[PDB]
């Protein structure tokens, strides 16, 4: 399985990939480009790359949690298990760094050129930090020293703590992957952002906790510091760590100090720093929360806003209370607490989708009418698109006796009433339709129609009907029969 | 009253129901579907169901407050009154669980199918938790033991505390009911959300308070914990509870610690947990508050935003100060601090409503004119819709001498002035109208008209007039008389 | 000056009044309505009423600050100066209450009817609270007692503290006045709201401070409370008050406790209450601040948002970097970091204003052209409105050699260049104009035109020109000369 | 280099300047205006002025940090190094003040008039404060005294502290420069605002820290204050300062008190003040953070909001799940998680840019077609603009057998399929085009076309084609060949 590896290195055909590039042909074309250099180049959007980054993340998170703690609360830093772990981690990071040269960079089209583009762009931006993070600097220093001891040890811990610069790399990895996920799974951005922030906060809190003890460790546990003053120098490491974290955490969430307000200058300064870091983090969190909340009820909010405009309009015109109430009722019936521009949405969609939607809505309404049963399907489709949805309140005249009816109505739904002088009253319900006589007559409507309950009609204007006919002359002729 | 129960189980005809489904016929149809299975199925939107859920809520809230407190601050948990209360509660929850099988689930149309749909969908989602919550697990355990004592008792309390999982159920109930209420009463979403959050916070605070003491109780009141260190082990239960709540509450609202910063590890950890929980809750609350504030002054805000755009436009064109001032004045008069797209709003409404609105606005204006007194009502209605509202600043020429008047004006309101060379000056007020001579003439206007004070006209363009006439030829002919 | 008072009682002719009602005639009409009842009715929007409310506010604020403090930190509550002050205040509030019956209520049109409308609507809503607040209840109680002493005194303080219910009245007064001010002075809503909140917070803080000491006072200064534990029972009143306020204030802003965490139950409960009140207030403040911030940079924000959409569009089309840069540059030149729909704004304005704006913009541009010097002013005006503003980037062909020019260009501004094969190159600057030959020719354009620097043209389409001509045939004829 | 200075004083030709004024000619004109007065007037937007303000900022920031500290933590305020520094600073501020008279003020066009406009407008607004800040008042007072000592010294410090009023000036300088930068570099407003606030907070914190110690210093270190109670009167200055800052900083970020809750009244009051200042600042910061967060993910948010409307629409129409899924898929393919009104954006742009964009998009698509190879470039350009982008889901009929094709399709991209009864199946890919036969025929389409995979077409309607032809009759004729 030597070619398999190569294949993996190329960008695979996934849901994401298609969205990014297009069709499978496009993907293939991209792959061809990649295939110019053999075993030296890795495509950023590839599956192998993804796997590698996942691995890194798994390692990286652990390492970030571990490293500082290891440095602080374990005195014997030269013990076997620790050292082996460190070495392996370093190796992994070196490998990652190496990969980064071979990996392509997203911009615009992705640059797959190795010797000039990948090497120079990486070396001019992020390389140095990565290099620092990956390598075991402290160990190197120790080796150099080998080829005052307490002082050296103290120095070394600080050097080791340069391995926290992997965090930048981690962040970078996260960002790209999040972007990819957005393209793929349609994740809620707000949710993602807040989650990221939470993680960051946790990490920062941990670091602060470590640091608070770390400085004392560095300074040899002086008599006027928080570790010596609480009398927990020789206590179990875990307990100490917990205490430190608590101290840090309070500063993060604005609760208070540890045992006592700082005495030594250094300690005080550290506390202040933590507070600053804590405070800003909390602010950011609050902001994120606010954003999330706004996102969550957004549609609803929009509806309310829209309604407020109507209210304002009413106020401007100084309408009677009854009128206002009626309008409110209409709005409730008409839109059902929702906000959407129907027409705009339809425009945004393609034709087939639109047609499908219309069929779902109105095919049952128009098919029940005997005029459209014998007609051709295309004609029906054409008609249906034209139809315009309407609502009427109870005790409202839809059509009137003697007034010229510009449009005909199909009752999808609702309790209507046919007001006629000659024929008494024939109440109409869902499925019925009217204004049919006044289509090709081009005159005044005979009888009246009043809404008994709330109604949901589909209006069809005479002009629109004429337009529709314009395409189907045979159909028009047929209609003209009776 | 055996059939009455069945009826109740079906979905009733309410305001909500109509909105959900449609007309009474639709509701009846839905009921028919429900009526396929007798005494085994409950419709989610039914009145009986609503009542049941209300009952549950009444029970549930009480139980959530009570349970933890009971577990903690009362040592004798095997006493009669407590046990009876518990048993009844358990029974009620079991009944609720049973109902949940028989109750239909909202999706899309509601699934009323029992054997497959209701049983499998519920069992695959929420069942297990509900089952756990409902049953008295601790009591069962005790019974088993019956058919080291201190240890057993300690264990049992934890088991009992599994009955807090009713909270999920409660939440679910609340959400659905809130949704229903939205459909029904048009509640302010923001307000609802914040209220929910407040309740949650309170509950959480209470739980934290219980927990802080609870852990000490579990651990047998060790010498280095907050209960033993304050010397309030044998104090009255109520006082202790209050203290615990205070401790919890401080962490929630970021105030501080209890008597002293934690000493024992467990206590410290608990405190940290509380802080986390507290802090997040506070953040959420803040966010909600922000959202609410934004909602409350939204219309006003929108107006301001709109105005800012006008200002920006002015800036871009670098207008003189006087001009800007004039524009500002016009805006104030024109819109009166409000924001609304009139045309859009009108489009959103149905025809009858629109007509009514127009009548309310302009029937008094047009009726006072003697041209529209003898005319037909339909014609008048047609005319009125066409009319377009306008405002003019004082010292502004509305119509001019010698310039062709494209439109005529009805003064609804304001202090106008007729500038004529021959006839001196005849100042016009609310109710007057002009540009009437230049309607069918198709030429140049004779005299000028200047605004004395601010005005509110209803313009009527000649083209629009012609269009209107197009429908009523007789009317046009009549007009042509004089 | 008996009639003067009556006049004052009626609604005056102010800026506000006109905006509310309309013209002076409208105001007069309103006044007539008021004048139905003599010396018994007060119009809500009147000047006298405003004055009265200002007076009340002046009194009310003072009283709210004073009362609680007086109750708490002065033992001798039966001393002369205090009592006189109280009595006067009570009298004033009674007077205010009386006025409230006679004052009209805003709804819709304002209800000026006394016997039924004003009396019943007020008595069914706010009366009782107002009555309670106004009257000296404590004094009445004392009188009753006159016609254990320590106990009575304790009771009386609580009764007296019912006079804080004036706060509701104050709030009501503020709201109405704020609304009026909005109509009048165009105040920033956000700013207003935050200011209100600040005031409320301050008042609440003060009350909390009073309360914290007040409860101890009521309870006779027990040995385990914050006043007795700090050993400041017999200290100077002012100091005590300050301390109390500090204690309250910390809870409001989430800082901490007083000297020590509460010991007695009552104290603890009070603290908790304060924290709740404090915390909510702080949240509200934060929200308000956020809102204010959003308001302040709103225009700018909108522009950025708009730009982001353009960027997104570019991304979707996957444009080259150069192209993107060009677009960015164009946007910067075109809109200058601002957001406004020109056309929409113009539509919103009246005609005269629009004309004025156009003159300010383009009269200097078109007048310099010799074609429009001899023409009539009306024609010029007509032309100018039609003109459409445009921008061109340097190294861009505006007009081309051999391509049919649909529109002509007036260079308001910018460094243009005339590219001709025959006539070499004649560089054009601000004031010049071109495409003039291809107006009535209806053919292909001869020479090319390229932008040297950035340009700001006013395009005029041939169709639009034709339309303009349609009104002025003589003008057209004249133009046709040469 | 005497004229060089003059030149510098005039407004230079920068990117900013052009944007502000226009072309170089405009800038020159502006310069001419400036050149009316020689060596007495400075233009606000000039380079020299900018440099001066930068210098001031550099000085000013330092001075603000230094002054208070100097006043507080150094007893010997009459020492040489300090005094020299002070004197120089004072001189600089005096110079700045002088410049301010000579500098022009931005409004509208900038006022370059010296004797009336610059002198009176400055003297009526900001002068006095500036004068106070600039001059060494304390030193003057001392001199006066020269021409109880402890008391005098105490008084003098307060007087000296009047030199903090330079902050207003600094603020003013910052605002203007920020505005200029916005015009120039297109900075993110939100980011700027937050940065400003941070700086302010830091400064305020520092001042608070100084103040907390300062009051004690003024009051002669009484026995019941925080400096005397901690026993750090004779400690090193730096340590004291740090402690003070910590105390201040806690109040700012809501953490807690210093060593102990205040005892003396003055101290308590100071603490309260700090808390107020701190609390408000924190609120503001939170608000700013929220704003920033909203800005950052704005585009994404907008997309989500838009999508929610579609969902709402679907809900309203009660569509089947499959349909909804299809719609979602279409949206994902169609818009790719982005929001933009294409048409609106195009309208906003100029013609050349639009043309360029179209070429980038569709020239490759239309050029591959042999119909447009021999045609003229102008015609091609015209055609391309008309084209309308479309998407189709797999298993969707684009064109049908027997149905009249109103528009023709160019496959930019995607896996299509040609459904024919006679000719079997010929699958089409990127670059192909169809509906070409039904262009000038004006009849029914022969064969069907179904989407195999997702597609991205460019539709071209027959009406649009006809319109395009209308300009190029020769082209039309050519097309009519075959």
mmCIF file of C-alpha atoms in Angstrom, chain D residues 123-344:
data_model
loop_
_atom_site.group_PDB
_atom_site.id
_atom_site.type_symbol
_atom_site.label_atom_id
_atom_site.label_comp_id
_atom_site.label_asym_id
_atom_site.label_seq_id
_atom_site.Cartn_x
_atom_site.Cartn_y
_atom_site.Cartn_z
ATOM 1 C CA UNK D 123 -11.765 81.119 22.976
ATOM 2 C CA UNK D 124 -15.522 80.383 23.304
ATOM 3 C CA UNK D 125 -15.086 76.554 23.547
ATOM 4 C CA UNK D 126 -11.865 74.879 24.811
ATOM 5 C CA UNK D 127 -9.318 77.637 25.534
ATOM 6 C CA UNK D 128 -9.628 78.060 29.298
ATOM 7 C CA UNK D 129 -9.070 74.421 30.213
ATOM 8 C CA UNK D 130 -6.087 74.224 27.869
ATOM 9 C CA UNK D 131 -4.614 77.374 29.397
ATOM 10 C CA UNK D 132 -5.027 75.938 32.886
ATOM 11 C CA UNK D 133 -3.399 72.666 31.891
ATOM 12 C CA UNK D 134 -0.460 74.223 30.069
ATOM 13 C CA UNK D 135 0.657 76.740 32.670
ATOM 14 C CA UNK D 136 2.517 75.737 35.849
ATOM 15 C CA UNK D 137 -0.010 77.105 38.369
ATOM 16 C CA UNK D 138 1.533 75.518 41.461
ATOM 17 C CA UNK D 139 4.935 77.015 40.683
ATOM 18 C CA UNK D 140 3.359 80.441 40.163
ATOM 19 C CA UNK D 141 1.593 80.133 43.516
ATOM 20 C CA UNK D 142 4.869 79.178 45.193
ATOM 21 C CA UNK D 143 6.594 82.178 43.619
ATOM 22 C CA UNK D 144 3.813 84.462 44.858
ATOM 23 C CA UNK D 145 4.172 83.030 48.362
ATOM 24 C CA UNK D 146 7.923 83.627 48.244
ATOM 25 C CA UNK D 147 7.571 87.261 47.092
ATOM 26 C CA UNK D 148 2.318 76.868 57.652
ATOM 27 C CA UNK D 149 4.937 75.703 55.143
ATOM 28 C CA UNK D 150 3.539 72.169 55.308
ATOM 29 C CA UNK D 151 0.032 73.502 54.693
ATOM 30 C CA UNK D 152 1.277 75.506 51.714
ATOM 31 C CA UNK D 153 2.981 72.412 50.298
ATOM 32 C CA UNK D 154 -0.236 70.425 50.696
ATOM 33 C CA UNK D 155 -2.176 73.137 48.883
ATOM 34 C CA UNK D 156 0.387 73.262 46.081
ATOM 35 C CA UNK D 157 0.076 69.576 45.226
ATOM 36 C CA UNK D 158 -3.642 70.008 44.541
ATOM 37 C CA UNK D 159 -2.888 73.019 42.337
ATOM 38 C CA UNK D 160 -0.274 71.017 40.436
ATOM 39 C CA UNK D 161 -2.812 68.244 39.889
ATOM 40 C CA UNK D 162 -4.720 70.786 37.688
ATOM 41 C CA UNK D 163 -2.198 69.750 34.980
ATOM 42 C CA UNK D 164 -4.257 66.557 34.394
ATOM 43 C CA UNK D 165 -6.669 68.736 32.338
ATOM 44 C CA UNK D 166 -4.298 68.060 29.386
ATOM 45 C CA UNK D 167 -6.243 64.794 29.110
ATOM 46 C CA UNK D 168 -9.126 66.600 27.393
ATOM 47 C CA UNK D 169 -6.711 67.995 24.815
ATOM 48 C CA UNK D 170 -5.199 64.549 24.316
ATOM 49 C CA UNK D 171 -8.656 63.061 23.801
ATOM 50 C CA UNK D 172 -9.477 65.721 21.229
ATOM 51 C CA UNK D 173 -6.232 65.045 19.386
ATOM 52 C CA UNK D 174 -6.911 61.311 19.381
ATOM 53 C CA UNK D 175 -10.433 61.698 18.028
ATOM 54 C CA UNK D 176 -9.440 63.818 15.043
ATOM 55 C CA UNK D 177 -6.471 61.609 14.230
ATOM 56 C CA UNK D 178 -8.632 58.490 14.453
ATOM 57 C CA UNK D 179 -11.114 60.048 12.039
ATOM 58 C CA UNK D 180 -8.289 60.874 9.645
ATOM 59 C CA UNK D 181 -6.960 57.321 9.896
ATOM 60 C CA UNK D 182 -10.432 55.957 9.116
ATOM 61 C CA UNK D 183 -10.497 58.019 5.931
ATOM 62 C CA UNK D 184 -6.975 56.864 5.073
ATOM 63 C CA UNK D 185 -6.413 53.194 6.084
ATOM 64 C CA UNK D 186 -9.992 51.806 6.475
ATOM 65 C CA UNK D 187 -9.587 50.808 10.136
ATOM 66 C CA UNK D 188 -12.173 48.663 11.960
ATOM 67 C CA UNK D 189 -14.205 51.177 14.015
ATOM 68 C CA UNK D 190 -15.178 48.740 16.736
ATOM 69 C CA UNK D 191 -11.557 47.712 17.220
ATOM 70 C CA UNK D 192 -10.489 51.359 17.447
ATOM 71 C CA UNK D 193 -13.165 52.201 19.997
ATOM 72 C CA UNK D 194 -12.318 49.272 22.264
ATOM 73 C CA UNK D 195 -8.620 50.151 22.070
ATOM 74 C CA UNK D 196 -9.384 53.736 23.091
ATOM 75 C CA UNK D 197 -11.459 52.523 25.993
ATOM 76 C CA UNK D 198 -8.712 50.173 27.168
ATOM 77 C CA UNK D 199 -6.228 53.040 27.250
ATOM 78 C CA UNK D 200 -8.682 55.224 29.126
ATOM 79 C CA UNK D 201 -9.321 52.470 31.663
ATOM 80 C CA UNK D 202 -5.605 51.996 32.234
ATOM 81 C CA UNK D 203 -5.098 55.717 32.741
ATOM 82 C CA UNK D 204 -8.101 55.931 35.050
ATOM 83 C CA UNK D 205 -6.863 52.943 37.046
ATOM 84 C CA UNK D 206 -3.463 54.577 37.445
ATOM 85 C CA UNK D 207 -5.065 57.816 38.590
ATOM 86 C CA UNK D 208 -7.221 55.950 41.109
ATOM 87 C CA UNK D 209 -4.140 54.210 42.475
ATOM 88 C CA UNK D 210 -2.368 57.535 42.857
ATOM 89 C CA UNK D 211 -5.426 59.125 44.435
ATOM 90 C CA UNK D 212 -5.887 56.411 47.043
ATOM 91 C CA UNK D 213 -2.433 57.150 48.478
ATOM 92 C CA UNK D 214 -2.638 60.837 47.588
ATOM 93 C CA UNK D 215 -5.503 61.529 49.947
ATOM 94 C CA UNK D 216 -3.583 59.945 52.822
ATOM 95 C CA UNK D 217 -0.540 62.015 51.922
ATOM 96 C CA UNK D 218 -2.684 65.151 51.934
ATOM 97 C CA UNK D 219 -4.244 64.201 55.287
ATOM 98 C CA UNK D 220 -0.765 63.566 56.862
ATOM 99 C CA UNK D 221 -1.113 59.753 57.168
ATOM 100 C CA UNK D 222 -3.727 59.469 59.964
ATOM 101 C CA UNK D 223 -3.703 56.379 62.241
ATOM 102 C CA UNK D 224 -6.935 54.822 60.852
ATOM 103 C CA UNK D 225 -6.187 54.777 57.088
ATOM 104 C CA UNK D 226 -5.037 51.983 54.758
ATOM 105 C CA UNK D 227 -1.408 53.164 54.525
ATOM 106 C CA UNK D 228 -0.904 53.461 58.302
ATOM 107 C CA UNK D 229 -2.945 50.309 59.108
ATOM 108 C CA UNK D 230 -0.809 48.103 56.809
ATOM 109 C CA UNK D 231 2.360 49.689 58.307
ATOM 110 C CA UNK D 232 3.813 50.792 54.953
ATOM 111 C CA UNK D 233 4.395 54.527 55.440
ATOM 112 C CA UNK D 234 8.215 54.374 55.298
ATOM 113 C CA UNK D 235 8.357 51.508 52.734
ATOM 114 C CA UNK D 236 9.941 51.998 49.291
ATOM 115 C CA UNK D 237 7.895 54.285 47.047
ATOM 116 C CA UNK D 238 7.566 51.771 44.229
ATOM 117 C CA UNK D 239 6.071 49.080 46.449
ATOM 118 C CA UNK D 240 3.562 51.565 47.848
ATOM 119 C CA UNK D 241 2.592 52.654 44.351
ATOM 120 C CA UNK D 242 2.110 49.051 43.278
ATOM 121 C CA UNK D 243 -0.098 48.384 46.280
ATOM 122 C CA UNK D 244 -2.168 51.477 45.530
ATOM 123 C CA UNK D 245 -2.589 50.429 41.908
ATOM 124 C CA UNK D 246 -3.673 46.952 43.009
ATOM 125 C CA UNK D 247 -6.246 48.493 45.336
ATOM 126 C CA UNK D 248 -7.550 50.687 42.528
ATOM 127 C CA UNK D 249 -7.448 47.875 40.004
ATOM 128 C CA UNK D 250 -9.540 45.536 42.162
ATOM 129 C CA UNK D 251 -12.249 48.192 42.356
ATOM 130 C CA UNK D 252 -12.077 48.649 38.583
ATOM 131 C CA UNK D 253 -12.492 44.917 37.837
ATOM 132 C CA UNK D 254 -14.854 44.200 40.787
ATOM 133 C CA UNK D 255 -12.490 41.858 42.684
ATOM 134 C CA UNK D 256 -12.492 43.309 46.189
ATOM 135 C CA UNK D 257 -10.898 45.674 48.690
ATOM 136 C CA UNK D 258 -7.223 46.135 49.603
ATOM 137 C CA UNK D 259 -6.016 44.712 52.929
ATOM 138 C CA UNK D 260 -9.231 45.575 54.797
ATOM 139 C CA UNK D 261 -12.627 47.278 54.344
ATOM 140 C CA UNK D 262 -12.264 51.071 54.916
ATOM 141 C CA UNK D 263 -12.418 52.517 58.453
ATOM 142 C CA UNK D 264 -11.953 56.312 58.119
ATOM 143 C CA UNK D 265 -14.760 58.156 56.340
ATOM 144 C CA UNK D 266 -12.612 59.820 53.696
ATOM 145 C CA UNK D 267 -10.976 56.541 52.704
ATOM 146 C CA UNK D 268 -14.367 54.857 52.486
ATOM 147 C CA UNK D 269 -15.687 57.624 50.258
ATOM 148 C CA UNK D 270 -12.644 57.367 47.997
ATOM 149 C CA UNK D 271 -13.157 53.613 47.726
ATOM 150 C CA UNK D 272 -16.802 54.129 46.816
ATOM 151 C CA UNK D 273 -15.836 56.658 44.156
ATOM 152 C CA UNK D 274 -13.298 54.243 42.702
ATOM 153 C CA UNK D 275 -15.883 51.460 42.634
ATOM 154 C CA UNK D 276 -18.338 53.699 40.807
ATOM 155 C CA UNK D 277 -15.673 54.697 38.301
ATOM 156 C CA UNK D 278 -14.409 51.133 38.068
ATOM 157 C CA UNK D 279 -17.850 49.635 37.683
ATOM 158 C CA UNK D 280 -18.960 51.997 34.922
ATOM 159 C CA UNK D 281 -15.677 51.448 33.096
ATOM 160 C CA UNK D 282 -16.107 47.687 33.274
ATOM 161 C CA UNK D 283 -19.660 47.974 31.969
ATOM 162 C CA UNK D 284 -18.445 50.095 29.073
ATOM 163 C CA UNK D 285 -15.694 47.582 28.317
ATOM 164 C CA UNK D 286 -18.200 44.743 28.305
ATOM 165 C CA UNK D 287 -20.415 46.680 25.916
ATOM 166 C CA UNK D 288 -17.484 47.369 23.619
ATOM 167 C CA UNK D 289 -16.495 43.701 23.666
ATOM 168 C CA UNK D 290 -20.040 42.711 22.755
ATOM 169 C CA UNK D 291 -20.034 45.189 19.886
ATOM 170 C CA UNK D 292 -16.708 43.864 18.628
ATOM 171 C CA UNK D 293 -17.961 40.287 18.756
ATOM 172 C CA UNK D 294 -21.076 41.249 16.806
ATOM 173 C CA UNK D 295 -18.934 42.999 14.194
ATOM 174 C CA UNK D 296 -16.534 40.097 13.796
ATOM 175 C CA UNK D 297 -18.973 37.362 12.732
ATOM 176 C CA UNK D 298 -21.477 39.742 11.147
ATOM 177 C CA UNK D 299 -21.616 38.381 7.609
ATOM 178 C CA UNK D 300 -22.022 34.825 8.855
ATOM 179 C CA UNK D 301 -24.742 35.929 11.271
ATOM 180 C CA UNK D 302 -26.610 37.677 8.471
ATOM 181 C CA UNK D 303 -26.556 34.511 6.368
ATOM 182 C CA UNK D 304 -27.992 32.509 9.241
ATOM 183 C CA UNK D 305 -30.700 35.107 9.788
ATOM 184 C CA UNK D 306 -31.612 34.976 6.103
ATOM 185 C CA UNK D 307 -31.795 31.193 6.210
ATOM 186 C CA UNK D 308 -34.066 31.348 9.254
ATOM 187 C CA UNK D 309 -36.555 33.344 7.187
ATOM 188 C CA UNK D 310 -36.630 30.585 4.567
ATOM 189 C CA UNK D 311 -37.229 28.032 7.332
ATOM 190 C CA UNK D 312 -40.068 30.158 8.691
ATOM 191 C CA UNK D 313 -41.614 30.363 5.224
ATOM 192 C CA UNK D 314 -41.423 26.583 4.910
ATOM 193 C CA UNK D 315 -43.042 26.170 8.319
ATOM 194 C CA UNK D 316 -45.835 28.547 7.325
ATOM 195 C CA UNK D 317 -46.502 26.458 4.222
ATOM 196 C CA UNK D 318 -46.101 23.218 6.259
ATOM 197 C CA UNK D 319 -43.878 21.519 3.707
ATOM 198 C CA UNK D 320 -42.811 17.832 3.745
ATOM 199 C CA UNK D 321 -39.435 16.991 5.287
ATOM 200 C CA UNK D 322 -37.944 15.817 1.992
ATOM 201 C CA UNK D 323 -38.883 19.084 0.299
ATOM 202 C CA UNK D 324 -37.309 21.064 3.130
ATOM 203 C CA UNK D 325 -34.126 19.015 2.885
ATOM 204 C CA UNK D 326 -33.980 19.622 -0.867
ATOM 205 C CA UNK D 327 -34.407 23.351 -0.342
ATOM 206 C CA UNK D 328 -31.639 23.357 2.266
ATOM 207 C CA UNK D 329 -29.329 21.525 -0.122
ATOM 208 C CA UNK D 330 -30.121 24.004 -2.891
ATOM 209 C CA UNK D 331 -29.369 26.921 -0.590
ATOM 210 C CA UNK D 332 -26.052 25.373 0.408
ATOM 211 C CA UNK D 333 -25.093 24.857 -3.212
ATOM 212 C CA UNK D 334 -26.573 28.140 -4.406
ATOM 213 C CA UNK D 335 -25.063 30.531 -1.848
ATOM 214 C CA UNK D 336 -22.303 28.536 -0.069
ATOM 215 C CA UNK D 337 -23.017 29.964 3.392
ATOM 216 C CA UNK D 338 -22.734 33.557 2.152
ATOM 217 C CA UNK D 339 -25.089 36.521 1.920
ATOM 218 C CA UNK D 340 -25.084 39.088 -0.903
ATOM 219 C CA UNK D 341 -27.611 40.740 -3.221
ATOM 220 C CA UNK D 342 -25.785 40.282 -6.532
ATOM 221 C CA UNK D 343 -27.917 42.698 -8.512
ATOM 222 C CA UNK D 344 -27.706 45.439 -5.894
#
